Amino acid sequence: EYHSVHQKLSADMADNSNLIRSLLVQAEDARLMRDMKTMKNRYKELYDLNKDLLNGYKIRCNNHTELLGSLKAVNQAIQRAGHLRVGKPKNQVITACRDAIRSNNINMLFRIMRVG
């Protein structure tokens, strides 16, 4: 879910950044031709887009922090499952655990960290 939300927000922010670049170029042209009204209009549009983008930036930053916490939690879980076993029976678990995440077999994953 965090992954999908990050992807959506990234696409949205990319769209808004393209809008801002076009606006910057569009705004510059008005200034060059000395059309001050349309220049002020472009800068108002840029201000509004920047505020929207900063709101999206806060949202995306909080989501990314939560996702990094979740990833570190998953990896610490793998390491605490393997850490419970000495010698070779440790290594196996780790490998299996990773091979249980790339396949999303969560029940079998838990069975690897339960019995080994």
């Binding site: 910057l24 200034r31 000395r34 001050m36 002020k40 201000y47 920047n50 983008l53 930053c61 990314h64």
Partner: protein
């Protein structure tokens, strides 16, 4: 002829009929056994036609039978339960019909008839879309038929009756179906881009033997098997061209840059390879050796379902059939033909008529190198002006616009007339009123029509332009007001007559001392004389003097014309002002310099904003979180600076425009006082009006200062100077914004001086 498909027996096949794939079949439906094939074509209009072409001719068409229901995918195979003789299958949308083309002979080329017998039929529950035929399983001497449906289902007939029928798993739009015999598999292309092969016995038992996700949906699939060494399966998409192995993976692929419509891997040449030929929607055939183009030809029509066959002792003739109704057997053209101008001694260049036309045109050329009336009427009363225009010749695309001045505003600007018959009048009416505070430089206004004359040479019409100028009254911008005894400055005009009552010159403003107030507050005083013969104009603003002075002189002229007397002057012997005129110039130039400074500051503010914006965009594109480091605060500050500077530039532009209008009024007055201070005729007054009144709006590339300076430097250069040293040192002209107004003022004073000594203006 090179790279063209040279023609063989060719024909058009009906009356706006329509065909598709499967229509064109080419085999021995006659079961002669000699090898020569026979063309078979059936449209979904109904007619089934069979031809035995010979290298247009009447007896080529074997038969042209007509069946009621449409025809889809005529085929030729062993579709009869008993014998091993080829039979012709006709698939109507909801019908199957096996026939037999039996040809009996008479004792003449055209005494031989052909009978098609209904061997058997099959009512189709579902609506058929297309079919394939082959020896399903490992049977020999039989040609079973697997028909598809428009809704996915595929039904198999074992050459006699309804064997079975199974639904295709997950298909919406039915694609091309084929049957591979080296793998005994039905291969189709589902709507979801999957080329899928099903083993026959798997479907018979109802699943997917294998799939391959090609990039598109295929138009055709042709499993070819004349090579028993390495089997392959060809799949022509609508954007690509694949040749797949028998296990399911791409053996090779071509990324075509055109839009294919049909293809046919025919007999091969080398070891392992397979020649193939594909037909563009750009009217071409391409002949690949499995990836590599070996030849290309320009087809006449868009080929649908090409075939290659031996027709009348010529092996490998290409038979194409369009979907409109054309059909053509053809052979490649391999004749490189010299590129050379045709020798046509008979066809000569007719020098007489051509030389006549050339003499006419050259006469026009060497000659040139050596229709509508407009009128304006102003009402005597926001005054309503009415403009009437009347044409002599019929005119088209007429546009009438009116231009008065910056301060004065019109209730209507542009009027569009379309074509008008000759001797037709058109009247327009608009209203002009003052909007602002400062009085306009002059009350006169212009009205311009741009029209077109339709001519034989240019049926769209040569454009012409004609104008007329009206004169607005003081009652639109002024009012009678209280006079003052003293004002900042004043000038005089001494006529050679008696001081006339100002009530007679300016009757609209009800003594011999009058006062005026324009809309805007400013006031002017007009003093007649008692002992002398001079009139005095006084105010605080040098601009204010111009309108009242112009109107005074004009009313004097008109009045003394009404009295019929012919000698009348407005001498003004004295001192041309040249000092209250320079201060307005300096104000204008200070505003210009302030504007340039404001703009070069706005440039830096915009650059800062862009840099901070790029930084923020970089922080946005980045995944990792990070403190904004108050970059948003710097952005807000820069944005506030930019808005402040933009408002400042707007206000400076407005101030500059006001200063320019006031300067226009002042220079009007100065040209008037120079044309009176010396006996200047109309020509020199026109030269001065052209040099001193160059434009009605400043722009960031041309302003009043540079233009009037260049004009005055040139006028002094070519007319009023005789020393070349000064001509090259001081009297130079450029069109760049100066850094000081001292050169302009020096040139103006020098102009008045060299006019005082007795100089006169000229052009050459």
């Amino acid at each position: 002829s090179l790279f063209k498909a040279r023609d063989w027996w060719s024909t058009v096949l009906g009356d706006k009929e329509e065909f598709d794939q499967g229509c064109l079949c080419l085999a021995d439906v006659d079961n002669t056994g000699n090898g020569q094939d026979k063309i078979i074509v059936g449209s979904f209009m109904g007619y089934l036609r069979i031809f035995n072409p010979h290298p247009a001719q009447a007896e080529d068409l074997l038969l042209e039978v007509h069946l009621r229901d449409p025809i889809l995918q005529v085929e030729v195979g062993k579709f009869v339960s008993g014998t091993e003789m080829l039979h012709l299958a006709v698939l109507h949308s909801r019908k199957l019909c096996v026939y037999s083309v039996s040809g009996t002979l008479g004792n003449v080329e055209h005494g031989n008839q052909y009978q098609i017998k209904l061997m058997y039929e099959h009512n189709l529950q579902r609506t058929a879309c297309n079919m394939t035929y082959g020896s399903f399983g490992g049977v020999k001497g039989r040609d079973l038929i697997c028909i598809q449906s428009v809704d996915g289902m595929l039904m198999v007939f074992e050459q006699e009756s309804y064997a079975f029928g199974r639904f295709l798993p997950g298909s919406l739009l039915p694609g091309p179906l084929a049957y591979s015999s080296r793998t005994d598999s039905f291969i189709t292309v589902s709507s979801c881009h999957q080329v899928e092969s099903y083993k026959y016995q798997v479907l018979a038992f109802a699943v997917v033997d294998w799939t391959l996700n090609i990039g598109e949906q295929a138009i055709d699939i042709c499993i070819v098997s004349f090579i028993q060494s390495a089997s392959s399966v060809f799949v022509l998409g609508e954007r690509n061209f694949f040749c797949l192995k028998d296990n399911g993976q791409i053996q090779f692929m071509k990324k075509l840059d055109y839009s294919p419509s049909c293809f046919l891997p025919y007999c091969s040449v080398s070891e392992g390879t397979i020649n193939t030929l594909i037909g563009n929607h750009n009217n071409m055939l391409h002949i690949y050796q499995d990836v590599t183009l070996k030849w290309a030809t320009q087809l006449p029509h868009v080929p649908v379902a090409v075939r290659v066959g031996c027709l009348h002792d010529l092996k490998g003739v290409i038979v194409t059939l369009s979907d409109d109704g054309h059909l053509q057997c053809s052979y490649l053209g391999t004749d490189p033909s010299l590129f050379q101008a045709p020798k046509v001694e008979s066809r000569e260049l007719n020098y007489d008529e051509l030389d006549m036309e050339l003499k006419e045109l050259q006469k026009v050329i060497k000659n040139v190198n050596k229709d509508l009336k407009v009128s304006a009427m102003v009402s005597p009363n926001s005054v309503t002006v009415k403009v009437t225009l009347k044409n002599r010749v019929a005119l088209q695309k007429i546009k009438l616009s009116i231009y008065v001045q910056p301060p004065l505003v019109l209730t209507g600007d542009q009027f569009t007339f379309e074509f008008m018959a000759p001797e037709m009048t058109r009247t327009v009416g608009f209203s002009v009123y003052l909007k602002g505070s400062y009085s306009p430089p002059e009350l006169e206004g212009n009205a311009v029509v741009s029209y077109s004359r339709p001519t034989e040479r240019n049926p769209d019409g040569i454009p012409r332009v004609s104008q007329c100028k009206f004169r607005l009254p003081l009652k639109l911008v002024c009012l009678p007001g209280q006079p003052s005894k003293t004002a900042s400055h004043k000038l005089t005009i001494d006529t050679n007559k008696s001081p006339v009552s100002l009530l007679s010159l300016f009757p609209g403003f009800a003594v011999n001392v009058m006062g005026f107030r324009f809309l805007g507050g400013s006031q002017v005083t007009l003093l007649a004389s008692k002992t002398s013969q001079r009139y005095r104009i006084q105010s605080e603003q040098f601009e204010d003097l111009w309108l009242i002075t112009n109107e005074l002189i004009i009313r004097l002229q008109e009045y003394f014309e009404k009295q019929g007397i012919k000698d009348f002057t407005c001498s003004f012997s004295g001192s041309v002002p040249l000092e209250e005129y320079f201060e307005l110039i300096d104000h204008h130039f200070e505003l210009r310099i302030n504007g340039e400074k404001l703009e070069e500051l706005l440039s830096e503010r915009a650059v800062q904003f862009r840099a901070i914006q790029r930084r923020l965009l970089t922080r946005f594109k980045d995944k990792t979180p990070a403190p904004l480091q108050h970059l948003d605060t710097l952005l807000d500050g820069t944005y506030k600076q930019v808005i402040a500077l933009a408002d400042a530039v707007e206000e400076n532009q407005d101030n500059l425009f006001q200063s320019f209008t006031r300067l226009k009024s002042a220079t009007h007055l100065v040209i008037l006082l120079i044309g009176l201070w010396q006996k200047l005729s109309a020509d020199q007054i026109a030269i001065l009006e052209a040099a001193f009144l160059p434009l009605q709006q400043d722009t960031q590339e041309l302003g009043w200062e540079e233009t009037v300076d260049a004009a005055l430097s040139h006028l002094l250069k070519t007319c009023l100077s005789k020393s070349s040293k000064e001509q090259a040192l001081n009297l130079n002209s450029q069109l760049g914004i100066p850094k000081d107004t001292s050169q302009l003022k020096k040139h103006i004073t020098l102009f008045c001086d060299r006019l005082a000594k007795g100089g006169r203006l000229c052009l050459s």
